[PDB]
Amino acid sequence: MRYGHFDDEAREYVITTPHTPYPWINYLGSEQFFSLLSHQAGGYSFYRDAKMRRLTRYRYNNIPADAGGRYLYVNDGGDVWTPSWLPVKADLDHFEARHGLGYSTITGERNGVRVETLFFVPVGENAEVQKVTVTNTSDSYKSLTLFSFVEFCLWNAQDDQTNYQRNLSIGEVEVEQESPHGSAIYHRTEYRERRDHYAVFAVNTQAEGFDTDRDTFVGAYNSLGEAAVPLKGESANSVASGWYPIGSHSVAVSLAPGESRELVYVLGYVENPDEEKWADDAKQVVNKERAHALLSRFATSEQTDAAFAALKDYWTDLLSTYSVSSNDEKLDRMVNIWNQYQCMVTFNMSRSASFFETGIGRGMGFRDSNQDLLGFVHLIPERARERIIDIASTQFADGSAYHQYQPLTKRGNNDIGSGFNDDPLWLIAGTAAYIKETGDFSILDEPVPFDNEPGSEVPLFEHLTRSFEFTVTHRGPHGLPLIGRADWNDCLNLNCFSTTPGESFQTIENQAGGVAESTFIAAQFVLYGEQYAELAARRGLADVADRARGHVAEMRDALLTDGWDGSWFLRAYDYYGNPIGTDAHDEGKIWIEPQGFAVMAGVGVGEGPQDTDAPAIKALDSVNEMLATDHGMVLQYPAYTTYQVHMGEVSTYPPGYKENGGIFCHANPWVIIAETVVGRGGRAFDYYKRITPAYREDISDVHRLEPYVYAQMIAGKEAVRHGEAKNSWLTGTAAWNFVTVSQYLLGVRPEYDGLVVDPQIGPDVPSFTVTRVARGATYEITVTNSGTDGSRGRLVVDGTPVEGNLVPYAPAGSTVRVDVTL
Amino acid sequence: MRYGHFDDEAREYVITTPHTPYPWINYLGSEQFFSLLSHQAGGYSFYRDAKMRRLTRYRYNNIPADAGGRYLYVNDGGDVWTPSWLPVKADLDHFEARHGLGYSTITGERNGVRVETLFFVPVGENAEVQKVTVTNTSDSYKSLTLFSFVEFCLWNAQDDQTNYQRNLSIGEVEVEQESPHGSAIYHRTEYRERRDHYAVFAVNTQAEGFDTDRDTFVGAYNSLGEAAVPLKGESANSVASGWYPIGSHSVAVSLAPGESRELVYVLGYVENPDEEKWADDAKQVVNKERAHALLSRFATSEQTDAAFAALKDYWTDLLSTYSVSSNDEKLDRMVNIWNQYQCMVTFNMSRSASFFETGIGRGMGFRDSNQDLLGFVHLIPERARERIIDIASTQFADGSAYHQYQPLTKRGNNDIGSGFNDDPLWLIAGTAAYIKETGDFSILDEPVPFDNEPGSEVPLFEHLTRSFEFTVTHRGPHGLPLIGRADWNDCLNLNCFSTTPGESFQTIENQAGGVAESTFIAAQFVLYGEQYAELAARRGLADVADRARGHVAEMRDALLTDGWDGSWFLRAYDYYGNPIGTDAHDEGKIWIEPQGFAVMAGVGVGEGPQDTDAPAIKALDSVNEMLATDHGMVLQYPAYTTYQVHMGEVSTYPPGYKENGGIFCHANPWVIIAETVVGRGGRAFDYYKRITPAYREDISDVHRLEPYVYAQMIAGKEAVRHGEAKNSWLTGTAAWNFVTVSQYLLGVRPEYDGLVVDPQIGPDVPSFTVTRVARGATYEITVTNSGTDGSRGRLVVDGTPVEGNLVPYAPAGSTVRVDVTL
């Protein structure tokens, strides 16, 4: 069944009931200020870093889930309810939530009163704005009191929920009932000491009353659904001192029948230079200038409506670089709106904060963030270029890298492990995708520190050299790269041997030495090793390019000789040089990661799909018999049913879950792309449709999570919950699936010299058009597609048959028309 | 007002309403298994380490507070309620909670049904047992279904609530409806991998049904008060796979009028040797032998009643070493029951887990744990002796110490900072108190590693030498000890200079060098420097003792010359050698810590209370004019009203809270003891009564927290919440207040050569008797007390006047009668 439906004209997902299988969230903001907002107004907001600057408090694993957030309590002659349904859970006559691009609306109506709240983060603002429209839909007059509500976090989210022994005594606010445009409350915890920032929570009318103390507003022994102040019908005017600061105004509203009233609430992040912090000599009063400035920018409905319209315009421009028109409207929906939109979210937030990721331990992953670029280069290239510099700056001089870094400070840390040997090659992966998209080679010349260290700056191209050489100088006995702590698969820990609990595998000390090798990193070196060689060559460094091609050539032979099991690729060699991922074993015979990535690098590829004997065809066929399920390909098979002490975290998950037999969706695109490489478009599209949101919308009761974005993992076939997703929104899946569908199934992809047009999608999409803006020119590409295996497109360029599948770049301002037959 | 009352005959605090100002908790267990239990059955259980082996889940900062726990849902013909009131919050005809020693009972009755639950951790058991008595108090028959409930934590409490991205997929159980004595559920998360332990949750009858999945039992969009299974009236028989494992049995009960039924529930921690983990070859099934064993030990009411009775006997024996009889029944209550009981809790749990301490970041503090001993040596000396070895083993070889260590592993860590220069001298403090209590000098000869390192073992006496010398070799320009990161006052950070947020002061890198000195550590070196010298002397090391006495003598002169402000002692010298705690400044003129501790070391003490000119008398008088409040003495005065960037965390608290003007209760005893040293017993008792639980019981609406135990901090007079406590139960206050009241106000204290009897308590306790068992002999001490300043007791020993205030130790088995006049 389903719990909503897409509105494509409006670019929304419409949720038509509060009763979803799980809270379904949207992200607001796309720059430096971000809100997680569920279809029940639950979630929170943070500036730049969800661990370090979290404005509002959110409880994960709450009972019930998502039972805190941005609430508006409506008092109608004693009867109190919330338009978001939760927390009060009063019966409503109408409920609807629309999740849009950077905005959502939530409408709830009861006993002839309707509240619509629009939530968004305005372009160029560090604030979350709410436009509330209250409508009398009844026959007679209405006298209402509205109580806004939000609960502050004390900035440090980790301190906020572990350190009450100090926390309970630092909560400080300032109250401003007569603000120049209404009323505002200031959350200024720790402003007295080191923080130069505070939050403001304001309404654009004179509020009747306020509250800043949670225990007063909610009342003893009470849930947010039983909150006392809204029930008494008048604010308490509480002034927090320690305990739990909140933001809350009451507003009196009288409405004739059919009359509506509009209110604008604002939650802002404000920052004063240290010299400019105090209004007063005594340093007791926050300087409020910048906050008033913000509040004057949203003092009226007109201003709010214009900011909303600017945000539409912003997304319209962003979505204008790639789109498609076909018979398949789910396909179209994903390519044109939701996947590109999700890619923007993953670029900004990485893997740190969702309704699964707690925005505590994880910042920006070195490998996750490089991979996110592949899906974001087309959207905003300038910000993509800057991010590459920031990531490369967390690389060490020996070519090894900080596994992740902190969003606020941009500085690397070892909080979730160090010494993952697959990390360095990803840097090449993102830089090359950026230069193909833009033609901007000048980034190779940007100076970049090692470990953020001044005076260590060398050109970014030299960072890429260190990345290539790191692998070159860390190969094992078979010539395959030494694995280290792990590769892309974080739970493949062959240098660990921990039999005692209490410490994560990701951070636990590793035993030095051994010969543990990785076929995945091997594939990775072949793929990104070439890209690095081609950059060196274009740079004019011919000896360098040739040496590297030599090393790539060698790793290719090593992969086929010592990394090949007979019917598929091996996965690794353990610390003592024993194979992993062989038919010789009873469990974990076949792993997806090497199969997809090796065939993507061209390894084992023969002449046709017809040439079944080619290693790539076998590995892929083995993958279809052993790994593929209705809901996607599982990670390896069979799952391990007992702890493999020499292998780390992988076998610690119950079978069918996560790294042990789960469907990691991120790995799927790799196989799908491989299928297009070997010419089986129909198979490749099928893999695509099984894990793609628009196609799984009709089994929303199985998937459970959002029908409009990719998830990290789906319960695999050895799991009793097979089909159910976890960890939605924040996943490499998004970027990699965009790369897959846009560049290999539809087949329009940037190269340094031209646009390649080489579709491979099968009989299910007989005709389509791609509109692609590249290098300042627009390419209109019409494809007539027979779907046949092994059949690749023949180009006509501006009415004239041409050879090959590459169209060289036209001057900006040009319009090129490409017609493809296959 | 009050919310309960003491029952002294039963040794209980009786809470007569659910509606307390804050959840009021008790601790169950006194060995290796521990439960936090509130008067609403909220809380959780853990084995040895509250961070690492937490069986059950608990939410801090919940809305409402304490809304999860060990519940029993009563279904009476469709009407569902809980005897603990929360979570359902149904009206009850009767409610009562009794908090006892290692046990509590909770009774709730509604519509002619009464449930009494007794909660305890049995002596010698790693389990929490519940004896439930259900009574039909109505006129007709009752058919009830009872639903037990508890929610598991996944052992690692920190992982459990930050790491859902992995957590949601590892939850595993086993269900055993036909257990040999009833029915049991097994929580076995991560047993598949590195854990050799699992939890069992069982009932001693055949349960009608079970649930192990929280979302099924509670139902979507529901709180625990709206839980669905109890309302439908039959279990769902859910088998968790990932998500949120719980434990739950339904039991059918039919009762004639006035009939009662008894049920025994058990929550156990079980551990199998690695060889003995599986029942089966396949390793899919936990070996259940040890769990069945446990369950057969509580299969009947009779067995449960005997374990309860053994626990009474255990506390009776423990409380038999020190007691008193006087006119003051609040005084008596504290000395005889609650303070000694609290001292046992602090010895076991330290500062790690309460309703304020999250049982995440803190293990066993090196200084907290040494100080806890002073209050626990008299109770169980054998376990005290062992703890001293464990603490000393976390000391480094240069004499410096790990600031805290992990309870499970006993290993030191720097999680909450390193390099606190007051830490090493505390080790002397606890060892000396142990040897005075026991006469066991042989502990000085026990071999002890530095940093838990095998082969580094030296005799404990040598650890004490390193402690003394560390101070000797780290003194500043005035001869006072260099402060380091901080002293006993953790927020006095003079080597910090951090103006950027995001990192705690306690762990943040300190700037090397400077001359920051501490007068507190100075006092500390004088007090514990003598104790170390006297041990060296008794050891026969005469050169060593004399050298040390020389150094103590010097530090005494340094404290009076360069640590004296004129009317009180200075607090410190900052990094550049500028004073802190001087009348020359507008804020923080006077700090409590040096005043109490210096006068306790004898520094500045003259001939009489009459000699007002003596520095000790001045400092104490300054302390009464400037620091003392109705609720206790604040830490310093005036509070700082702006960030002092050169001073660390202290000024980051709002005035009147914690280290910035709060009443730290732990520091109070030091002044109180000092008052007895200078002979002002009436003043000393007054300070005592202001912060002591039995005396503050009549302002329970002000104190808010438990009326039966000490808290860490009370809002100081510059706080708008002046009088309100935070951080109850876990505080050095307990140990230090026991030392104060038992050894200096009542004046009976152990010395190596005899019992000293030297009461100093004032006119409010004109007569009393102390019964003190020391060295195997019983001393009966009757005191006739005029209360007069400067008047010290004259002893009569077994009917015969003697000189001095020391009674030498009699052979075990002896009874000595001491009569004191003053």
- State the DSSP string of A759-778: ----TT--EEEEEEEETTEE
User: Do residue B162 and residue A361 have CB atoms under 8 angstroms apart?
Assistant: yes
User: How would you class A381 by CB atoms within 10 Å of its CB: exposed for 0-12, middle for 13-18, buried for 19 or more?
Assistant: middle
Question: Does the N-terminal peptide bond of residue B87 adopt cis geometry, omega within 30 degrees of 0?
Answer: yes
Residue of A nearest to B60 (CA): A161
Ordered alpha helix ranges (H), A228-364: 228-232, 289-296, 301-318, 329-333, 339-349
Q: How far apart are the first and last CA of chain B?
A: 37
| Chain A residues in contact with B712 (beta carbon < 8 A) | 165
List all residues 6 or more positions away from B678 whose beta carbon is below 8 Å from its beta carbon: B599, B605, B609, B614, B616, B617, B620
Active site residue A574: no
| Chain B residues in contact with A155 (beta carbon < 8 A) | 501
Q: Which of B163, B192, B652 sits opposite A643 (nearest CB)?
A: B192
In angstroms, the CA B200 to CA B295 distance is: 9
Q: Is the distance from CB of B267 to CB of B276 less than 8 angstroms?
A: no
Distances (CA, A) of B819 to B18, B336, B681, B774, B811: 47, 21, 19, 17, 19
| Strand (E) or helix (H) holding B438 | helix B423-438
| CATH 1.50.10.10 residue window(s) in chain B | 329-680+711-745
Q: Which residue has the tokens 């002839």?
A: A112
| Strand (E) or helix (H) holding B210 | strand B209-213
Q: What is the dihedral of CA A651, A655, A660, A664, to 10 degrees?
A: -160
Which of A3, A24, A61 is the best mutation test for B, with the most CBs of B within 10 A? Answer: A61
Ordered alpha helix ranges (H), A154-246: 157-162, 164-167, 214-218, 228-232
Q: Is the distance from CB of A70 to CB of A28 less than 8 angstroms?
A: no
Please tell me which residue in B490, B565, B758, B819 is annotated as part of the active site. B490
| Alpha carbon of A190: minimum distance to chain B alpha carbons (Å) | 7
Q: Which of B357, B498, B721 sits opposite A242 (nearest CB)?
A: B721
Tell me the torsion sign for CA atoms B248, B254, B256, B262. Answer: negative
User: Do residue B726 and residue A221 have CB atoms under 8 angstroms apart?
Assistant: no
In angstroms, the CA B555 to CA B558 distance is: 5
User: How would you class B458 by CB atoms within 10 Å of its CB: exposed for 0-12, middle for 13-18, buried for 19 or more?
Assistant: middle
Residue of A nearest to B51 (CA): A502
Distances (CA, A) of A228 to A318, B19, B479: 46, 16, 60
| Chain A residues in contact with B62 (beta carbon < 8 A) | 59
CATH level 3 topology of B322-328+746-822:
Maltose phosphorylase, domain 3 (2.60.420)
Phi-psi region of B190 (alpha: psi -120 to 50; beta: other; left: phi over 0): left
Q: Is the distance from CB of B351 to CB of B372 less than 8 angstroms?
A: no
Residue of A nearest to B406 (CA): A502
Q: Where are the beta strands (DSSP E) in A478-615?
A: 517-518, 572-573, 579-580, 590-591
Q: Is the distance from CB of B571 to CB of B589 less than 8 angstroms?
A: no
The structure tokens listed for A344 are 């923007």
Which of B57, B165, B635 is the best mutation test for A, with the most CBs of A within 10 A? Answer: B165
Tell me the torsion sign for CA atoms B662, B666, B667, B668. Answer: positive
Q: Which CATH superfamily is domain B272-321 in?
A: mpn423 like domain (1.20.890.20)
Please tell me which residue in A66, A490, A565, A574 is annotated as part of the active site. A490
| Alpha carbon of B225: minimum distance to chain A alpha carbons (Å) | 10
Which of B221, B277, B350, B507 is the best mutation test for A, with the most CBs of A within 10 A? Answer: B221
Task: Give the A:B interface size as CB pairs under 8 Å.
Answer: 191
In angstroms, the CA A231 to CA A80 distance is: 6
User: Do residue B170 and residue A361 have CB atoms under 8 angstroms apart?
Assistant: no
The yes or no reply on domain A329-680+711-745 and CATH 1.10.287.610 is no
Residue A424 neighbours by CB distance under 10 Å: 30
| Chain A residues in contact with B501 (beta carbon < 8 A) | 52, 155-156, 190, 193-195
Tell me the torsion sign for CA atoms B743, B744, B750, B755. Answer: negative
User: Do residue B60 and residue A726 have CB atoms under 8 angstroms apart?
Assistant: no
| CATH 2.70.98.40 residue window(s) in chain B | 1-271+700-710
User: Do residue B221 and residue A18 have CB atoms under 8 angstroms apart?
Assistant: yes
CA atoms within 13 A on the CB side of A191: 27
User: Do residue B361 and residue A721 have CB atoms under 8 angstroms apart?
Assistant: no
Cα A369–chain centre separation: 10
| Chain A residues in contact with B168 (beta carbon < 8 A) | 356, 726
| Alpha carbon of B805: minimum distance to chain A alpha carbons (Å) | 42
> Phi and psi of A198, rounded to 5°?
-150, 165
Q: Which one, of B254, B688, B166, B266, lies nearest residue A650 by Cα?
A: B166
Tell me the torsion sign for CA atoms B632, B638, B644, B647. Answer: negative
The structure tokens listed for B370 are 């040494």
Q: Is the distance from CB of B417 to CB of B489 less than 8 angstroms?
A: no
| Chain A residues in contact with B172 (beta carbon < 8 A) | 654
In angstroms, the CA A194 to CA B502 distance is: 9
Q: Which residue has the tokens 């079970």?
A: B210
| CATH 2.60.420.10 residue window(s) in chain B | 322-328+746-822
Q: Which of B642, B658, B720 sits opposite A166 (nearest CB)?
A: B658
User: How would you class A473 by CB atoms within 10 Å of its CB: exposed for 0-12, middle for 13-18, buried for 19 or more?
Assistant: exposed
Q: Which one, of B688, B801, B800, lies nearest residue B744 by Cα?
A: B688
Residue B231 neighbours by CB distance under 10 Å: 15
Q: Which one, of B626, B706, B733, B814, lies nearest residue B4 by Cα?
A: B706
Residue B806 pairs in a beta bridge with B756
Q: Which of A163, A194, A726 sits opposite B500 (nearest CB)?
A: A194
Q: Which one, of B127, B124, B99, lies nearest residue B31 by Cα?
A: B124
User: Do residue A721 and residue B242 have CB atoms under 8 angstroms apart?
Assistant: yes
Distances (CA, A) of B271 to B181, B276, B280, B288, B383: 20, 10, 17, 10, 23
Q: Is the distance from CB of B48 to CB of B408 less than 8 angstroms?
A: yes
| CATH 1.20.890.20 residue window(s) in chain B | 272-321
For the B1-271+700-710 domain, the top CATH level (class) is mainly beta
List all residues 6 or more positions away from A429 whose beta carbon is below 8 Å from its beta carbon: A370, A371, A374, A527, A528, A531
Listed as own residue / partner, the contacts of B765-771 with beta carbons closer than 8 Å and 24 or more positions apart are: B765/B326, B765/B327, B765/B328, B765/B331, B765/B685, B766/B327, B767/B326, B767/B327, B768/B324, B768/B325, B768/B326, B768/B327, B769/B324, B769/B325, B769/B326, B770/B322, B770/B323, B770/B324, B770/B746, B771/B322, B771/B323, B771/B324, B771/B325
Give the method of determination.
Answer: X-ray
The structure tokens listed for B264 are 């025994």
In angstroms, the CA B286 to CA A89 distance is: 42
| Chain A residues in contact with B653 (beta carbon < 8 A) | 169-170
The structure tokens listed for B59 are 């939410």
User: How would you class B714 by CB atoms within 10 Å of its CB: exposed for 0-12, middle for 13-18, buried for 19 or more?
Assistant: buried
- B395 three-class SS: strand
| Alpha carbon of A572: minimum distance to chain B alpha carbons (Å) | 21
| Chain B residues in contact with A361 (beta carbon < 8 A) | 162-163
User: Do residue A168 and residue B501 have CB atoms under 8 angstroms apart?
Assistant: no
In angstroms, the CA B37 to CA B43 distance is: 5
Q: Which one, of B60, B21, B26, B22, lies nearest residue B41 by Cα?
A: B26
